[PDB]
Write a protein that holds these residues in place. Structure first.
Motif, PDB file in Angstrom:
ATOM      1  N   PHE A 128       4.022   8.780   7.765  1.00 48.56           N
ATOM      2  CA  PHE A 128       4.926   9.905   7.864  1.00 48.56           C
ATOM      3  C   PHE A 128       5.542  10.196   6.506  1.00 48.56           C
ATOM      4  CE2 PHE A 128       9.401  11.241   8.842  1.00 48.56           C
ATOM      5  CZ  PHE A 128       9.115  12.536   9.217  1.00 48.56           C
ATOM      6  N   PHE A 129       6.135   9.198   5.876  1.00 44.81           N
ATOM      7  CA  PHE A 129       6.764   9.415   4.587  1.00 44.81           C
ATOM      8  C   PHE A 129       5.760   9.894   3.533  1.00 44.81           C
ATOM      9  CE2 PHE A 129      10.335   6.230   5.798  1.00 44.81           C
ATOM     10  CZ  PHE A 129      11.226   7.233   6.145  1.00 44.81           C
ATOM     11  N   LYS A 130       4.569   9.317   3.528  1.00 44.34           N
ATOM     12  CA  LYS A 130       3.498   9.681   2.597  1.00 44.34           C
ATOM     13  C   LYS A 130       3.078  11.141   2.824  1.00 44.34           C
ATOM     14  CE  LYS A 130      -1.260   8.259   1.437  1.00 44.34           C
ATOM     15  NZ  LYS A 130      -2.362   7.300   1.752  1.00 44.34           N
ATOM     16  N   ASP A 131       2.957  11.532   4.090  1.00 44.93           N
ATOM     17  CA  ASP A 131       2.590  12.900   4.451  1.00 44.93           C
ATOM     18  C   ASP A 131       3.643  13.909   4.016  1.00 44.93           C
ATOM     19  OD1 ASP A 131       0.145  11.997   5.598  1.00 44.93           O
ATOM     20  OD2 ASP A 131       0.857  12.235   7.699  1.00 44.93           O
ATOM     21  N   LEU A 132       4.939  13.620   4.258  1.00 41.46           N
ATOM     22  CA  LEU A 132       5.981  14.530   3.875  1.00 41.46           C
ATOM     23  C   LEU A 132       6.016  14.701   2.384  1.00 41.46           C
ATOM     24  CD1 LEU A 132       9.198  13.568   5.885  1.00 41.46           C
ATOM     25  CD2 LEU A 132       7.530  15.308   6.512  1.00 41.46           C
ATOM     26  N   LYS A 159       0.849  -1.204   0.000  1.00 42.51           N
ATOM     27  CA  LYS A 159       0.000   0.000   0.000  1.00 42.51           C
ATOM     28  C   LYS A 159       0.876   1.242   0.000  1.00 42.51           C
ATOM     29  CE  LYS A 159      -2.953   2.772   3.004  1.00 42.51           C
ATOM     30  NZ  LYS A 159      -3.994   3.228   2.028  1.00 42.51           N
ATOM     31  N   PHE A 160       1.964   1.212   0.768  1.00 44.25           N
ATOM     32  CA  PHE A 160       2.868   2.337   0.867  1.00 44.25           C
ATOM     33  C   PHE A 160       3.485   2.628  -0.491  1.00 44.25           C
ATOM     34  CE2 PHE A 160       7.344   3.673   1.846  1.00 44.25           C
ATOM     35  CZ  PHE A 160       7.057   4.968   2.220  1.00 44.25           C
ATOM     36  N   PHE A 161       4.077   1.630  -1.121  1.00 41.58           N
ATOM     37  CA  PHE A 161       4.706   1.847  -2.410  1.00 41.58           C
ATOM     38  C   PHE A 161       3.702   2.326  -3.464  1.00 41.58           C
ATOM     39  CE2 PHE A 161       8.278  -1.338  -1.199  1.00 41.58           C
ATOM     40  CZ  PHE A 161       9.168  -0.335  -0.851  1.00 41.58           C
ATOM     41  N   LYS A 162       2.512   1.749  -3.469  1.00 35.06           N
ATOM     42  CA  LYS A 162       1.440   2.113  -4.400  1.00 35.06           C
ATOM     43  C   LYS A 162       1.020   3.573  -4.172  1.00 35.06           C
ATOM     44  CE  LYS A 162      -3.318   0.691  -5.560  1.00 35.06           C
ATOM     45  NZ  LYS A 162      -4.420  -0.268  -5.244  1.00 35.06           N
ATOM     46  N   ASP A 163       0.899   3.964  -2.906  1.00 38.07           N
ATOM     47  CA  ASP A 163       0.532   5.332  -2.546  1.00 38.07           C
ATOM     48  C   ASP A 163       1.586   6.341  -2.981  1.00 38.07           C
ATOM     49  OD1 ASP A 163      -1.912   4.429  -1.398  1.00 38.07           O
ATOM     50  OD2 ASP A 163      -1.201   4.667   0.702  1.00 38.07           O
ATOM     51  N   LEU A 164       2.881   6.052  -2.739  1.00 37.04           N
ATOM     52  CA  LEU A 164       3.923   6.962  -3.121  1.00 37.04           C
ATOM     53  C   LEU A 164       3.959   7.133  -4.613  1.00 37.04           C
ATOM     54  CD1 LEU A 164       7.140   6.000  -1.111  1.00 37.04           C
ATOM     55  CD2 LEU A 164       5.472   7.740  -0.485  1.00 37.04           C
TER      56      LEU A 164
END
Lengths: 22, 22, 22, 22, 22, 22, 22, 22, 22, 22, 22, 22, 22, 22, 22, 22, 22, 22, 22, 22
Positions: free
Chosen positions: F10-14, B9-14
């Motif tokens: 945090f990373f997504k927010d930044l 989810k993190f990688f997809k979101d970024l």
């Protein structure tokens, strides 16, 4: 719970914490 | 969410932020 | 979702973002 | 879905994304 | 579907995608 | 939120602040 | 559960956690 | 279940997890 | 089930899992 | 709680604090 | 190796791991 | 290594770790 | 290493840590 | 090291600290 | 040794222990 | 030793301890 | 060191202090 | 030693202590 | 020593103290 | 010594004092 059952529950629980899947 | 699901989810979101397509 | 299913969904999702076709 | 079925679905899906024909 | 049947369906499906005739 | 979830948020927010897209 | 049954359940459970399929 | 029956069930179960077909 | 019957059932079951035809 | 059960609870609790998932 | 050759090698390799005969 | 080759190597490697036979 | 190769190495490494077999 | 490589190294390092196996 | 050979050796060995004739 | 070989060695060893014949 | 690298070093260092394993 | 090997050694060792036959 | 190895050594050591057989 | 190793040494030492067998 008997010793062996505790031990298996413990390892299963820790792995669940590490994988976020308890 | 489990660890692996979070990670995906993190990688997809970024990538969605970088491509402007979330 | 199981690990293998997550992994395939992840790759499919990223490719969809790259091709603009999700 | 079983592993082999997932794998075949995955490859079929990716090719469909590449050819724009899913 | 059994393994062999999956495999044949997979190859038939991919060829159909390549030839645009699924 | 668990540690890993915090970190990803945090990373997504930044990145959202840097790209002006939160 | 007897020892041998515990042991088999333990291994099956851990593999299920690793594969995300318990 | 007797020992031999447990052992066979165990191997069958693990293979089912690996192949995603339990 | 007797030992020999278990053994034959086990092998038949595993092959069925491998061939996707149980 | 018996000693062994305390010990396992302790380790599980600390890991939960470290991972933010108690 | 071409795709089809990879796929066949992959399935053959996995079966060899499952049967302990690579 | 190409994507498909990586993917097959990955699955083969994980199974080898699970079966203790890499 | 490319992204996909990193990801596979990461998962393989973590599993090796969990199984004590890196 | 690139971001993704840092992230994977970080998670691998933390798990190694938790398991006492760095 | 392959899986099937291991399994047969295992059963033969256990019976030898039970009968005192390994 | 692979997983299956470990498991068989383990059971054989325990039985040998119980029967005093390792 | 870049920000992200500092952050990961910081968390790794603190955990090492908590576990007595820096 | 890998996890599974440790676990088997542990159980074998404890039984040896209980039976006075390590 | 890794965590799991410490834990097994600890239990083995305590039992040895209780049975007077370290 | 790391935290977990200290803790195990501590418990082992106290038991040795109680049993007069350090």
């Amino acid at each position: 719970m008997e010793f062996v059952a505790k031990l298996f529950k413990f390892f299963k629980d820790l792995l669940g914490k590490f994988l976020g899947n308890n």
